[PDB]
Design a protein around this ligand. Structure first.
Ligand SMILES: O=P(O)(O)O[C@H]1[C@H](OP(=O)(O)O)[C@@H](OP(=O)(O)O)[C@H](OP(=O)(O)O)[C@@H](OP(=O)(O)O)[C@H]1OP(=O)(O)O
Ligand SMILES: O=P(O)(O)O[C@H]1[C@H](OP(=O)(O)O)[C@@H](OP(=O)(O)O)[C@H](OP(=O)(O)O)[C@@H](OP(=O)(O)O)[C@H]1OP(=O)(O)O
Ligand SMILES: [Zn+2]
Ligand SMILES: [Zn+2]
Lengths: 396, 397
RNA sequence: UUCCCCACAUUGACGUUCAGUC
RNA sequence: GACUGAACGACUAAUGUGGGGAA
């Protein structure tokens, strides 16, 4: 009973185990193609993640959208005030950023010519802005349970026998947790007071990054498109979360949504999303050797993968990633001009510095507050953000 | 890196920048060792180390380590003292300056203690009145990392967006005033539309605001390191040098220390915007991530051992007041004020014998303070935050 | 069930050494 | 120098199991 798939909604559109095994095969497969059958230099991974899109029930109408690896976060000294760094390179966190490029691309594809609109996954929304066509779903694959609430208790395979949580009501369950710089495990936020500072970090204060478990729970409320893309499009959710290993149904479902079911007063179109949760039929084996300092990423359409030094947030020659704040902002800005102002979901105008533009997404920003509040009232801690200095930059 | 190179001073150049830096860097750290049974003591665990070195002449070994201190945290708001027994700010460099104040009081006492001792005192009578420094004495500030606040806000693994010298095509003006956040080693900008702190208000739990060291040192580079009370006896003293053991970026530091308020006008006589020598050291400390110790060490030449203060409370572990608190400093000043004949005061002892009122006796210093506050507002850099006026109304014995 | 105490385990940095690539 | 791959040591602050308690 512990390691069994957890169905999603009220009308069931795919077979659970078939999908899980499908997306694990597809992503792990496409990761093979990118690495000349795992023989490549940067093919050594510790954790693998990816996003799969589906257009319909035919499980060969599936497309691998993104593939990524990584287990590390940026060093404190290497934070970039020009937004050129990858602050978090845990596999699944990167696949979401990889997904963002594909969404921007799809927006670009729509506003190119009327003949190309039919090829784009987006369409106009009666409410203003853009929405997905009625049959598009996205699915998250992680080769292992996400760090934090889904993985911290029992980081090892269940021994089945439905070895449910013998102590499900400890204060420590459902707690928000942060990756800590220069230390292992993931730690509660309560016991580590909040509000980070730029200079505080530069001095030696350990950089705190939210756990992947908490980040996805977040994706299950404000959606995966994030603030900037939410100005163009309506909130998008993962339909499924598939784990290639370390699956504990009870733990993952708490961490992914159950713990914030107290959330109220979400803005229109926003909701607490409860995706399909599942392990795969043949769980992945634990990967050999020391864990690599680099984090790989790819998005469908790309000619090559990108290899990032997780320590620094840049590549080997010190170049900014295609996934960093500064690039994503550039894509956003380029599309913002190609989109007519009667077609925006939010018409509030702000200067063109990063933090300020994110603030134009009032509803998304609102949803976030409902989310932070949910965790707090549940006694699960206050969310921890990067120093406010991190997002104060323009496009040169 | 053009970025990691010394910026010579607009003061007196008596030593070579780089020889001097490595000199005071090596001494303070050496003297911090001696105080801690060679770094083996419990209290040798620091995050930040600071110190003051004095020089008497051009020979670069005629130096004396005057003060040594450690600390990265501030008092908790709830724990402030209405009788001035608490140390509101225990940051390494802030603490070094207060210890230096003690060295200043001792040297004044030394002068008016014995006629023979006057030749041993760093002070001399001044023709303009009161006391002034001997014609070659300089003080040098060492900090093991760039001071918190504006001087530290930047990416140390990226080139500088050199401000295009032709009206920022967007908008700019960095250098904004920033405040230490209570229960943290860090800093946040000041609300450009803010409130003012109140005594009963903070004590309940409202944010205590203490200005960042970057903003404090800039203040030292205008009104001097001697503070208000001591300016009644002696003339303004400035650091000739500021040496950094890490996170040194010349253009950033020069900004935070003086360049951002170069718009300063109508300073009183003897007061000026001091532009000291800025420099890093050759073998920089590496960033050591981990907890910042909750305690603050301090020492002043003449002392037998160090004093250790709980930064959160501003007192020591047994709740005894530090030698650096307002009340202690007042005790030293009052001792001197009676030993000094009234024609020799730089301002007339007019006002009553409560702390705040005596600070107002320093008219030229107070004036200097106001021009400084005004420099920051007109520069579009935020308004300075002063503690509620209750902090400073208390008396002695 | 929850917490406490003690013991034993589990899970990103640092240092030492060894092997290679540009 | 940077990156890469194996060994050993020592840190990190949560978390697990057990024994004993407690509500
Ligand atoms: O995918 P991630 O690596 O976790 O990045 C996110 C993302 O920031 P960027 O897209 O700008 O990198 C969030 O932005 P949204 O698009 O979700 O709005 C931002 O959220 P805020 O808007 O709340 O700043 C959050 O940062 P924070 O730590 O401040 O929540 C930050 O995650 P990291 O900073 O942990 O990478
Ligand atoms: O070394 P610091 O901890 O920064 O102390 C200073 C110092 O006060 P004390 O010497 O009495 O401790 C200033 O005094 P002067 O420079 O005038 O001698 C004072 O400024 P004012 O006395 O002019 O108000 C200021 O306090 P404020 O917060 O009011 O600026 C205060 O700084 P802290 O309050 O951070 O100690
Ligand atoms: Zn993770
Ligand atoms: Zn400071």
């Amino acid at each position: 009973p512990s390691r069994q798939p957890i169905p999603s909604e009220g009308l069931q559109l795919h077979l659970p185990q078939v999908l899980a095994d499908a997306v694990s095969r597809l992503v792990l497969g496409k990761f093979g193609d990118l690495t000349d059958n795992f023989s490549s230099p940067h093919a050594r991974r510790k954790v693998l993640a990816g996003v799969v899109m589906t257009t319909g029930t035919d499980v060969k109408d599936a497309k691998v959208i993104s593939v990524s690896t990584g287990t590390k976060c940026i060093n404190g000294e290497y934070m970039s005030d020009r937004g050129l760094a990858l602050n978090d390179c845990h596999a699944e966190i990167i696949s979401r950023r990889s997904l963002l490029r594909f969404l921007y691309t799809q927006l670009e594809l729509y506003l190119n010519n009327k003949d190309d609109q039919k090829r784009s996954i987006f369409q106009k929304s009666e409410r203003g802005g853009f929405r997905l066509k009625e049959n598009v779903q996205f699915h998250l694959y992680i080769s292992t349970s996400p760090c934090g609430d889904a993985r911290i208790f029992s980081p090892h395979e269940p021994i089945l026998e439905e070895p449910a949580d013998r102590h499900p009501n400890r204060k420590a369950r459902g707690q928000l947790r942060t990756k800590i710089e220069s230390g292992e495990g993931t730690i509660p936020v309560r016991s580590n007071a909040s509000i980070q500072t730029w200079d505080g970090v530069l001095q030696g204060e350990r950089l705190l990054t939210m756990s992947c478990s908490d980040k996805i729970a977040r994706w299950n409320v404000v959606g995966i498109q994030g603030s900037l893309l939410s100005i163009f499009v309506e909130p998008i959710y993962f339909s499924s979360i598939i784990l290639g290993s370390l699956y504990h149904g009870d733990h993952l479902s708490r961490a992914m949504y159950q713990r914030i079911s107290n959330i109220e007063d979400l803005p229109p179109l926003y909701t607490l999303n409860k995706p399909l949760l599942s392990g795969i039929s043949n769980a992945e084996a634990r990967q050999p050797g020391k864990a690599p300092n680099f984090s790989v990423n790819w998005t469908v359409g790309d000619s090559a993968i990108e290899v990032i030094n997780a320590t620094t947030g840049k590549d080997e020659l010190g170049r900014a990633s295609r996934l960093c704040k500064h690039a994503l902002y550039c894509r956003w800005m380029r599309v913002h001009g190609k989109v007519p102002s009667h077609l925006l979901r939010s018409k509030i105008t702000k200067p063109n510095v990063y933090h300020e533009s994110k603030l134009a997404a009032k509803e998304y920003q609102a949803a976030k507050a409902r989310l932070f509040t949910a965790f707090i009232k549940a006694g699960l801690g206050a969310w921890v953000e990067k120093p406010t200095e991190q997002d104060q930059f323009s496009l040169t």
